[PDB]
Every structure is written in C-alpha cells, then in structure tokens.
Amino acid sequence: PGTQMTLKTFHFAGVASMNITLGVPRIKEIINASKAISTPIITAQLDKDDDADYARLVKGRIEKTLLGEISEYIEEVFLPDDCFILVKLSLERIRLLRLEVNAETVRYSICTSKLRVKPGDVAVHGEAVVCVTPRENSKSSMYYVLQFLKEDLPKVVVQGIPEVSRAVIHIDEQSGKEKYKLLVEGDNLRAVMATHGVKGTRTTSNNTYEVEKTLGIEAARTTIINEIQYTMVNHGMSIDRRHVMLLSDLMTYKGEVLGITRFGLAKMKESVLMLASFEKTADHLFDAAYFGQKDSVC
Amino acid sequence: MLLFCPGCGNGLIVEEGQRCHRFACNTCPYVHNITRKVTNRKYPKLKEVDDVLG
Amino acid sequence: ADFDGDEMNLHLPQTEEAKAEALVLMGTKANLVTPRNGEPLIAAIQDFLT
Amino acid sequence: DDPVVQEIDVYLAKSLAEKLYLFQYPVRPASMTYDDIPHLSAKIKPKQQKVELEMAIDTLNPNYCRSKGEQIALNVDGACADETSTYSSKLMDKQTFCSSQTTSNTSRYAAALYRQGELHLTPLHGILQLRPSFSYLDKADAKHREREAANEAGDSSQDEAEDDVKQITVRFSRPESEQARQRRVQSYEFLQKKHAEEPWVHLHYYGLRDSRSEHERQYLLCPGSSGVENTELVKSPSEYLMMLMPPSQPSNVLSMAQLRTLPLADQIKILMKNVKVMPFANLMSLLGPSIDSVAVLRGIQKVAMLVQGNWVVKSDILYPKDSSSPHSGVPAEVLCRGRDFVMWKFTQSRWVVRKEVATVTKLCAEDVKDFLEHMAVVRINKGWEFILPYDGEFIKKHPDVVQRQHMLWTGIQAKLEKVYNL
Amino acid sequence: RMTVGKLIELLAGKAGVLDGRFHYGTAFGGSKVKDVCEDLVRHGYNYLGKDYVTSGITGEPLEAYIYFGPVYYQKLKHMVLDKMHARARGPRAVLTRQP
Amino acid sequence: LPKDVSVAELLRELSLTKEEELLFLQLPDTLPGQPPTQDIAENACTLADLTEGQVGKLLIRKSGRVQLLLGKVTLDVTMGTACSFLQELVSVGLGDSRTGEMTVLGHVKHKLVCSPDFESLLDHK
Amino acid sequence: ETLEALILKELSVIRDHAGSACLRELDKSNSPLTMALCGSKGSFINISQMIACVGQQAISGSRVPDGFENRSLPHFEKHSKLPAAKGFVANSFYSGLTPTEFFFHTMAGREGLVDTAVKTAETGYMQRRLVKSLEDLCSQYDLTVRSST
Amino acid sequence: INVEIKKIMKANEKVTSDADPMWYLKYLNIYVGLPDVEESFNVTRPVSPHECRLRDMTYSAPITVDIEYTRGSQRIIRNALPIGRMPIMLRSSNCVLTGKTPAEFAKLNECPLDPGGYFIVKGVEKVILIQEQLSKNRIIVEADRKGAVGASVTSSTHEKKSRTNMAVKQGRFYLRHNTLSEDIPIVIIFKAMGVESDQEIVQMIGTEEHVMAAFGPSLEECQKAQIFTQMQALKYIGNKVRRQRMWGGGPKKTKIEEARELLASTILTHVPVKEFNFRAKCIYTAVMVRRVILAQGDNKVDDRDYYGNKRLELAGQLLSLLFEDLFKKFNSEMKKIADQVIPKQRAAQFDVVKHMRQDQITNGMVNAISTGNWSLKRFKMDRQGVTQVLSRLSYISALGMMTRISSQFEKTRKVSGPRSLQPSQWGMLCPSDTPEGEACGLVKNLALMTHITTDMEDGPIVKLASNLGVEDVNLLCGEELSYPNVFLVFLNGNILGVIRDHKKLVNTFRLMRRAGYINEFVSISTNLTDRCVYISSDGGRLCRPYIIVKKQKPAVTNKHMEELAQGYRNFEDFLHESLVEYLDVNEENDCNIALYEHTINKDTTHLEIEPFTLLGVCAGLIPYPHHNQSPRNTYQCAMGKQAMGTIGYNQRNRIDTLMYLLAYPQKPMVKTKTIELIEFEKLPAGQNATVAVMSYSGYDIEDALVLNKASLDRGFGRCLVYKNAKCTLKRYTNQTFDK
C-alpha cells in the first residue's frame, strides 16, 4: 500500500486547514514510535456539544494565550520618580474571547515559570492595568534590563496549557444534531483531559507516545491501530484489521511502544546475526564479541 | 525605546541620578533629565476570535 | 507488468522437494487472492472486460 | 510644454575653486547646528585631505555629568601629569571630529548659490564626512597598559637595579621577497605611516555669525554681464554623445551598418552577392539618395548583368575561381558556364524548362535547381518564371546601358554556342 | 493516455498520402482537422479515417469501422535477442564463489 | 513631508520668498564643451576648465519639466536624495602657508541632479 | 485563500458541467464511452478532459504558484489572479492546448513524476525495515503467534 | 582558444626563481596552430577527425609559444618551441572541418550534417555538458533547519571563494565565516569597519519602527560589552581568529592586523575596498541586514530554483580554468627545477629548454577530457561526470545530447526541490524533454531558440550609470536607503549606488542598449519589493530574442519580413534597428510579453517570435504535441534518443563499438517545422506503416502490437547491427613483438 499510496494533498479532513502529515510519512512516523511527531492532533469531546459559548470557553481554557495577544498596548513609562513597564489589558477582547483572565491573574502568571521577576516587582494599578518594575539584579542585568523584559513580557502566558499551540472548534453537522468538538494541535493529552468541561473519557490523540504515557499500553495499541486504519482509508485502499493488530501487538508486547527503527528492533530481537545484518554491523558484532553472547539458530 | 546622544551618537541608557532619572551615554558625560512623562506604545496585535470551522 | 519492454526472471528449481513446494504453495491457482484484503488480483483485464 | 517662466541664468565662479570644501555630519540632523558651539582649532593637510576639528563643549549645563567627566578625564590622562593632556582641566572639555574622504575626484560636484534671477556655480576641491572620533579611549587604553606595567614593576617596594642591559639585537635587513614587499606596502600600517609623514596645518574657526563669513560669501559670485555668449560649450549633440560615450577601440556576415561603412563598390558587390536579384531603384533606395546614380550604375555594371530590365549578379562573383560545387564538387568554371547559359535562356525567353537546361549543360539536377532558385520561381503548367517582372522604366531611361548589355549578351551567346554546340 | 495527437497525426498523414502532401504538426499550430477532413472527403474516403473493413479470418464485415492510416513507427534498439539470457552453472567469482 | 519637485522648489524660492538659498547640484562627468586652450583628445571637460560669465540657462517648461540649456544640448534637472542631516558649505582658504582661514558660507538643504537627455541626443541623429 | 477556493470551485463547476454535457451529447457505441462504462480502461474524467475541457492544473493541491515576481509567467499582468493566468485550461486536447496551458500541464506531469520517484525509494526502505522487523513471527499449532525466542 | 588563452598566458607571462636573481623566463605569444599528428618521425602531418576515430588517437593541435630567457645572463630567444597539445573541438575555428563544402566533407569522410562541437580523444567522442550553478556574489535569504530566516553570500573573486552567513538564532544578528572561531555580533563588525557611532549604524540598517525594534537586541548585546571603538572591535575579532595551522613566519603582533586583513580581503571579497575603506562593505552589510529584517516578517523567502539567479558554464570556461591550473603547475615545476639545478650543477649555464617537458599539459588535458573527473587544487573544485560519451544511436540522439544541461546538485538523493518544472524555464529550456527515471528534472535540454551570454568589459556600463545621475554611495549616509522612493542600483552583486525615479533610469538604459552603445546582452531588471535595480553583465546568463512592441504595434512589419526573405537584411540588422532584442530571465520578469498579435494589449512591451520554439530538439519531433499528455511527450523524447536510424552519410566508413542502422528508412509524412530546421528528414529514423487501430486476436492486451508477417517479409522493420572487434599487437620493453 505504501507504493499504492500517492502522497496526495488537500486532504484537510473537512476543516480546510491544519495541514496534517498523511501517507507514507505518517506511516513512517507511526512505525518509528518517535516521542515527538509532526503536527500532533488531539480530538476532545465536550459535555455541552450543542452550545458554542461553552465550546469557545473551553477553547480559551485550553488554548495558550500570551499577554501580548490580550493586551491592547504596552508602554515603557519613565516617570521622574521611577521607571517601569505598564500593560493595559483589553477587557473588551477578553469578554469577546470569553477568557477568565484579569489583572490579578496576569500578575500571578508573571513571576511564575519564567523571567524570575519577584512578586514584589509586579503590581496592579487598576481594573485592567499591570505594572512591572525591573531592578539591578547584578547578574549582568542593570536597570536597563528593561530591554529584556520588554522583549519577554509580551510572550508570557496568561491562560491555557503551555504545550498547546492552537485549538479550534470543529463541528459535526449530523442530521440529528450539530455537535461541537475541540481539535488541539498540541502535544499534551493529560492537560487537555484534566481541563474543565472536556469529556476526558472520549479524548483521543495522534501521538502514540503521549497515549502510551497517559492511558497505558493498551490505549497506545488501540490508538496505533485506529491511526493506521484511518491513514490507510484516507487513500481509498483497505487492509485487513488483523495485519495492523499484529503489528501493534508486536510493537506493544514488552509493555513499551518500540518502533521499527534499529533501536526498537535491537530492544525487541535478540539474535546477533539479524541485528548485524540490518544495521550497525561492526558495532553490533564487536559488542557481541565483548559480551560473548551466544546466538542460537531459532 | 532607542535614543542616541547628540554628542557621539551612542545608545542612551536610563539611570537613576541624584535628583531624577535621566538618559545617559556610556562613552561621554552627556546626560538628559526627564521632565515630563515619556511613553512608547507598541500596540500588539491581539488574538482574534477565531471561528467555528467545520 | 505492461508488456512495454519489461524483463522478467525465470528460475528452475533443482530439487524435487523444492519443485513440489513451489507448485503447491506458489501455485497460480492457489494464489488468486492477495493476503492483504482477500481481493482477487488474477482476473479479467483490458480487452477482456470490454 | 514651452518655457513659460523661470528663465534663470547660470554663472560660473572660479574664485574659491581650490578653497571650497563641503563638510557634512552624518550623525547631526540639520535642525541642530554648530553655530553656538565655540570651536578651538582645525588640523588639516593640503595633500590627502583629512581635517580634524577640535571644539569646546560647556560643562555648567545640566546636560553634562561632572562626576563621569572627572572619571573619563582621570582615565584618559594621568593624575597631574599635564604634559600631553587631551583636556586642559580635569573634565572632558574638548571634542574631536574626524573627517573621512568620500571620493578622490570631486570635479563633477559643484556648489550652487541662488540669487534672484541667477545661479552661481563654484567647483568643490574636496568633500569630507565629519564624524565624532573616539581617540581619547585609545590613549586611555595605552595609559592603562603603562599603569599595569608600572604595577608589575612596583610589585616589590624597593626594586634592585636590574641588569637588563640591551644586548645588541640588531636584526638582519633581510632582502624582502617581492611578494612580501608588496604585502608590506599594501599593509594598513604602511599607509597610516605614509599619511602621518605629511605635516599637519592648524587653522582657526570662523563661525557663520562672524562678519568674515558674510564678507567672504560674496566671492561665490562673479563680475559679468547678464547676456554673454560663451566661447566654449558649443559642441553639437552628436559630438557630446561621442564624448560621453567613447568607443572601446554565410556571406551575410556583414550587417547593414558595417556594409554602409565600406566603399560603394564593395557595397554593391556584397548586395549583389547576397540578393543576386534586385532592380536598380531598390539598389538606389538601399544605398541611399545621397549617392549619385552614375556611380552606382558604373559599380553595378561590373558585378551584374541586365536581364529583362533587372540586374542579376555575375556568375564569377558567386563562385570564385578556387570554389567548387557544394553538391557535386565540379569546378567553378562549369558552374559559371551553366549560370551564364541559364541567364541567356532567361533573356531570350521568360519561361525556362529545367529538363532542357539539365540536358544541354549536362549538369546534375541539384545544380540546375540551385541555379534556377536564385533567379526563378516554379509556376505550375509553365515551368520556371523570372522572380521579378519586366522593368521597362530602367530600359527606357538608359538605352546606352541596354545596348552595352545587349552586345555583352551577344558575346556570351557566341561563347555558349561555341562551348555547348547549340 | 488521451493521445489525441496520435489520431490527428494519423488523419493528417492519410490526407497527405492521398493528396501527395506533407502536413505539418507544428506545436501550437499546424494543419487543422477541417483541412484534412476536406482533403479526405475530396478523394472519396471517409472524413474521419474510419473505413469499411472486412474480417480476413471469417470473411464477414465487421460491425464497427476500423481506424486506418499511415503512422510513423520507429524501432528502438531494445531487442529480445540481446536481452535474452539463460545461465547454466557457468563460472563463479574468486572472492565469493557465486555467479 | 511630501516630496517636492524642482519646478515648485524654484517657484516657492523666488515667488513665495526672496531670500537666497544654497543648493548642491551634481553635474555630469563631461560637459558639452572643450577645454579652452588647456593643452588638451576628447578628455573630460569640467567646471575647472570653463571661465566665468554666463555659461547656460535654466528653463522651466509646463507640466513640471526643468531643463538646463548649456549650449546646443539640453540636460534635465531632477531632485536628488532628500538629505536631512546637517550639511555646512564652508570655504577653507589657505591664505598663508602657516595659517589659513575657514569661512562658513552657509547651510546646504536641497540637492539637485543634472543628467543628459539621452532620448533627445539619440532621436537627434 | 477564500478567493482561491471560490475560483477553484467555479473552475470545477465549469469542468463538471462540460463533462456532463459531453457525456449527455455523446451517442452509444462510442469506443471511449464504452471502455469507460465497462471499466476496462479510462474514466469519464479523461473523456471530459480529452473532448470537452481539461481540468484545473493543480500543483500540490493548489493553483500554479507565481514563479516570477507576483505572476506565474510574464505573459500575464502582475498581481493577476485570473483563472487562465493561474493554471486553468479552457481548451481541450482535441482543440489543442495553448503554450501556457501546455507548460502548466508539463509542470503537473513532472511534479507527479518526481513524486513517484521519491515514493519508490521511500516505500522500498519502509518495506525493507518492516520485513526485517516482522520476519520472525509465525503461527504455531496451538493457535498462538510466537516469536523466534 | 583565441582570447582567453592569451589572457591566461599574459597573467603568467613572467616566471622566475628566488635563488640566483636576474634570471627569468618570459612568455611572449602563444599559438595553438592547426590539428596535427605526431606519427611521423619528428614531423607533423594534417590528420582528419575520422582518421583519429579510426586510429584510436586524439584530435589535438600543438600548443607552441615564443619565449625569451637568460642562460648565462645572455638573452636567448626562441620563436617556435612546442609546449603541449590542446584537443581541438570539431567545427571550431582551427578545426579542419570548418569552411568546408559537402564535397570536401566527403573527401575527408565526415558527414556534413554532423553537429560537431565534441572532442575526439583516443578514438572516443566525448562531449562536455553545460554545467549549471548558482549565481555568485548574490545575497540569498533562506530559512535554516530550525526555521531561522538567515542570509548567505558566496563572494567569489578570481582567487578565493568564501561563503559568509548571517543568522538571527537569538534575536540578534551573528555573522559566521569559515575563518572565525565563533560567530560574532554584527555591531562589533560595524564598529571594526570604521563606523563607530551607533546612530550611523541604525540609520544604515533602517529608519522604520519595526526595523529598530528588531535591531534593538543587537545594540543592547553590543552595549553589554565594552566594545565602543574600532581598536577594541578589531582586538575582539583577532581574539576570535585562529591561525591556519601555524603559518610560516613571525607573527609579530598581527592579531589586529590579521583581523583587519580578514575584514578587508577575506570577508566579502566581491566588495572592493579602495584603501582600507570599508564604506562600501559597511553599506553592503547594512543592506543585507535590512533585507533580513524585512524578510523576518512577511515570508518573502527567495527560492533557489529561480533560474534568473542561475549561471551556465560552457566548455570554454572549464577549459580556461583547466589550462590556467596546468600552466601554473608547469611554471611551479619549472621554478623548482631551476632552483634545484642552477646553484650547484656546474659552470655550464642551465636553460629551461632542456627541462620544458611537453607531455605535462597534453596528458593533463587528455586525462581531464577522457576520465571526466576535474580536480583543481588551486580552486578546490572536485567535479565528476563533466565529459560524457557521445551517443551515436541516431542523429537525433547526438543532436539532443549535444544541447544537454546538468545540475550542480549532482543527483545522489531525492531532493524533489529542483526537480520541479519552474516557470522560469519559459523559452530557455525544453519543459518536456527530460530523461525518464532517477535523473528526471536535473538533466535538461535547451530550447530551440535560445542563447547564452558571455562576459563584457563592464566599463561603458559603469560610465553610463555614473553619467545618468547615480549618486555616489559614499557621499550620503545610509539613511537615504530607508526612503521609499530611493532605489539601489547594483552591478554584478556590487552596490553601484542609489537613484530616484528608477523608471527614467531603466528606460534610458534600455534605449541606449537598443541604440547599440551598450552591449545587447547586458540585462537590467527592477525589484519593487526590495527596491533594487540589478544590472547583470556576467557571462552564462540565458537570453531569448523578442520583438519590441511600442504602442500596441510590433516594430517588425511585413515589409521587414519581405526584405529578410529576399536577403536585403539579416538578424543582425533586426538587432541593430531596434526591432528584435535579447531579454534575460531577470529582465523579462519585469517586461510584458504577448504570445500572438491578437493578445497584444495596451500594456505590452514585447511579442513572442514563435510559440513552438518553447520545445527543444527531441520534443520537436512530436507531431501535434499540444494534443497529447506531458508524460507521453517525456517518454517520446526519451525513446527518440534511443530511436534506430541512420547516423550520417559516413556511417559506412564509421567504425564504432555498437551501431544500429535501418534498412529502408523513410521520412515522416507529418513533419514539424523543427524537423525541417534540424534537417532530420535527410536522416530519418523510422518508417511510415499503415496502422489500423483495433483489437485483434487478443495478442495486444497491454501496449503490445500485432505485426504482419508479409510486411516483415518484404523488408519492413529490417535492421542492421554493426559491432566492432579491436585487437592490439604492441611492442614490449624487450625487443619482442606480438605476432
């Protein structure tokens, strides 16, 4: 089927966007069992799939939002008494996107996980006003270290999962009812399931490593099977489910998803001759000579 | 923001003097005290509402 | 194949056991279907369907 | 679009041709000027122009930091040495602007002073860009190095008399290879030393507010009448174009321009060799009307023959004596005889049969085809017809040439009857 | 393969051999289909190349007309005589004793 | 600040106001003339070879055309690069071999560029 | 992208309508139509392309990209997003393709050729790996699939 | 062989040794002469190419030179002393086949229709394929593996080639060069190149708000350090410099000196410095930084496949480089022999005549043309597959192989990026002609109507640019570079200056080129996105002729075509009369071309001469190609190169290792105009058969065909295969011979 697959394009899966790798590259990424894949997709179901307000709310809850994306203007004000960076939050855009963010939440997000600024340096001067006061930390950072914060402060997260990069509201238009789901282009399934309003029981993912680490090895096997079947069906060619089931089991019979690459092949197999013939001939041969591993003819 | 000394043309840092904050150059004694408020807005593009594709 | 100049290989086994195994397992009548999905590959072609 | 208004005159001044310089500050906007800044001196060199301005800056102004001034003054100079100090007092009081040369030649640049109804142009002897130089830091670093050396020496309280007598380390003045000598000459240090070899010249500064400025500003003008016809600047557009763009220094290789540059005889010869069929009017039009008709006629009578009022290039012209048939390899004489027979048949009758010519001349089909295609076209049910129509105008205009060509064709017919036994 | 160019070439060649001419198949031009159809109908042949043909085996006419015409076929250097190969025991290599 | 044009520049320099102005124009490498008795060759003819007096006229035709008639040929004058930094035209006259005088003549604000009208020179002959 | 999608939709509408018209006007016993009906070789799309109108030349699932500055070929105006200037082929193979249409078709053909060339080697390597990894399993007599060890 | 060889000889006219001064060897004039054979004992004899093909020898001419030297301080001159042998290309100026008639060709046993242009070495016919490479001295903005949009520039001069890059890995611009241990900030390099004020640097980079916002981090990083003067920056650079493995000679505190030399000579070699004046180089790096900043926003990344930035090296440039390298090696060997012989041999004065080995250059050229592997240590160029065996399968095969072009990529893996058919190949290369297989997309063929430009003097170009008002870059600061109406004018990668109202400049330059004062091959293009006026005059650029259109009416009329048909004018006359002009890829990128007259609109500058010229030679045989599919045309071109047919009129006397001939070859009935142009009808490679499209006996299921027995019996398809069996009876060292 790899030769039969044409490696087509324009197959956005009905969203007309979010280019996903499908075809021989996708089968390669699946069989390699790489920890980080290209264009990871996470499908999450909603408890209230008929309401769009709740869908956008859970989106804003899961989607990463930077401070610069919600603030209307950031200005460095050098008052005659002291200098500090000021940030004005656009409450209008906040209520438009339905993000549960305020000045105090922004202050708490600052000083945490980035830029090391202490809580005593950040203050709130109004309903949608935040202030940051750098200091002479003496770590090659004089007061003009402003020029660092002014470049880093706009990229500080205020809400959402840091790993999540983009989340969209997909809609299924079934004749019975039009339902809403979340398509997240991130690499964090645990955080998506742990978020409020997301039906963690019917949440899947494309990255096999995340499924393995989160929901066990059987979940990883099922995800591999479903993903291979879907990737093969996208090209109009069908394969008996038994082949993909055997492949997934062989990849998930030692309790860990081991890829088909030389590393997983060596971790699974034990014959020295086969490993030496596949790849790394001299290295494997010298390692076996050192270990004195006797190889059978099974 | 970026400002330069009329004397030599190097960048002006902001430092706390003996009376008031001032712009100063690291290669000459030129200084300039701040009298009124000075602001430099950037107007970041915000996030937009994205839609319900599907 | 498409009969456009393709060169194919022809091998002759040198053992009765190999001959029997090739005739039984690799028999044309016994492999009219592919193990991928069971669909028949050996069927009519152009100038036979028309 | 006619010159309705603003017919301004242009005058030229040579009073300050060698004394006019253009100083531009790439780092100083035009809003702020140095008119209020008291200058101190200006070093300059006549050759290899590089001017360095030494000005004074105030200190009591609030835009000056006295502590940092003292710091930089103590860093650049010593505690109280003051023998060679970049600043007279203990503060940074003098500022140095160094000049960089934009281009070597500035003859194409001129300063234009505009007065009511006139514009005076004065050449520029040189253009330099003035930028704030950082030279006090180099002396500060040298002083820091000498202070470090002094500290290394005073590492001990009392330093015994060192027996560091300078052994005679006189090195060989080795004969330097030409490549290494060129590398040395092209080195930056050598150029800098050569520039420094020229002595400096000190000049005082006279600001724009001084009376001397307005006094000397009048030299940019020139005494002269309003209307004067310049003796020079009278070359035609073609001469100017030739000045501002000086020159660097098949048989149809030569183009039309290269053709016209050759004598009339060569032009006619090449035109008859390329076309082989053309009327006289077309030749006169191509060569040009400025050429007399008698000369063109005498030239074409030598390399062409008259056939039905048209001109056909002679056979020997197309086939030199050392050439041969590209298809059969027969000598050029036989080709000339065959072409003459074809031309004679065309003069006798407008319709010529290919088979008859092939049978008489005993030539192959391809040679006869090439001979006919040069002056004939295929007409169905009629054979071969002359490509051009009967031109009676040229025959009526020149009867003497017609008679000359008739007797020449009679001679050629006699020769052909003798050769081919017609 | 949608090789209509082959059909156009065949029709033009048929018209040329009928009227004793050499049609041009110049790219983005050449002789049009209407001219060759006129040439075919003028000489008494079908204006589409298809002609009434009788089966040589059974001797009965065919239910469908056959598309005849002169086509410029060129033989390639690939021959079966040079590509035919059969290997007996034969020699073996010195390093590894294989054919 | 809108980009001005030479015609309107001269118009507002003479009609709207009468104060003199210092300009810096760039002439071509070779002028349409011959060095007068300068010991030659078709070499470059610059202002250093020409004498004083009237050397050419400046015409302002309709539609904003600004030409310079410097004899039989006519160049065209356009606005050069709009310089915003300080440009001081000064006269450095070395009256004595030991002491000279530097005279600030004025300030340079606008720059002009004179170019041969190659189209006319080509269509002429 | 909205304009691109709308133009592609309009061109596909033209293509499908021309194909439907050609199929409805064609009479039975037509060899191409018969071979497309029986499924021996070809299809209705090829018939519509070679009779009625060739479809939009799509490179990587999109219109012909601008090879030159702001335009595919110098023969079209700059910033011109017209159909004929981006890959559309109004003429059919029977009527002949214009120079630009032929060039776009050759571009699509070479794109497909290079795609297949890369696919050959990629799938060869993938098959080698998969076989070398899965060549050890076998079905035992106790209905349990076991490895070599 | 007529110009470049003389320049190479003049570049190394004098060679001398350090020991025993006042001794020298001066070259005066070099000649190649006519092809000859060294068979006769110390005597030359004219030899024809066919004889060399038969005798398995090389078709070369003796390279001689007149010289003057000093034996014992007495000047001795030689007027004719052979030094080597240069393989002579067929149908060249010195070739014996040129200026010959078909009868004289028959006398020499050579086909008149033979394309020629290929070398004959040891009996084999080798062809030097046209090499394709990227244009040198050009800034390329591209994304890195990690997505960082950086810049690169490969400055290549006649001596050294150096690729310097600039990255934004950490929001600030670091410059990377092969001679620096670690990439250093760009502001330090600015301060080291003379410009020490940060305001001037910022003005040179740009005055736009986003430009300063993006460049702020670099200024801050430079301020963190104590680098504020030129001396400090030069010292830092020297600290970031490593010796080239202990260069011989006393350093003597050359750290700052080495830094300045690398800044002046090594970095950006194409940008010249008059006398340690980096102003031009400073402006160049500033424009590069500005381009990188502008590209860091909107993803306007330049593509490598754009053939407007490609250059084609023919056999001339390769042979010139090879001859220069061999001559330098010969001079070095002679100087070494002199140094070894003169100081200790004897009172017998040494002379180079007794040591001038004549086999060096001959063997070098023979090995370079035969093996095809070129190893130039002076340029560090290691190329392979430069020369290929001319395929004599048929006349079309050779005619198409002669006009091939290979890619610099040197296919070894699946890149799939240059393999695509770019719109830039319009009118220059054949879109359909390409070898089907692994070499698909990288082995291309030239179009039917195309031309490759050569190198010009570049003097009058600079003079006209200076006389057209181009302001000197050194006269104004870099702030003017940030204005919207100021356009940069370049010249072969070098900043020529700035200009305003570039429309007038371009129009006047084009009119002057049409007039004839400027070489018709000099290309001028304008890029409004970057606001840059490129003036290209280097060789290797692809140009195509186009009819000039003025005011909706082409300059070419029916009268001009009638005059051309009658012979009054030629193509050079159309070129001189401003009727047809050559346009380059970069130039036509800005021009408007019309395919036909009916397509001419108000905004049209040129007209297409003929559309069918888009196809190449092999694709020209396809009758009605616009009615077929593109893979069909590709396979047809591939098989036409292997089509069987006659080779030439001398195919009977020709003896090759493998030849295929057709018994009764017939010319096609549907012949394209390209067939008449290439004279393929004289040497056809097929037969016209009465084919009937139908199914018969089911023996034609998949692409197979049924042949008629009687047709084959009457001579249809009968072919002939000619093979060669060669044997050698050579004499060994001992006085014994093979009998």
Added chain:
RNA sequence: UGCUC
C-alpha cells in the same frame, strides 16, 4: 555515466 523497467 548512460540506460531499460
């Protein structure tokens, strides 16, 4: 290297 498939 050229190819064939």
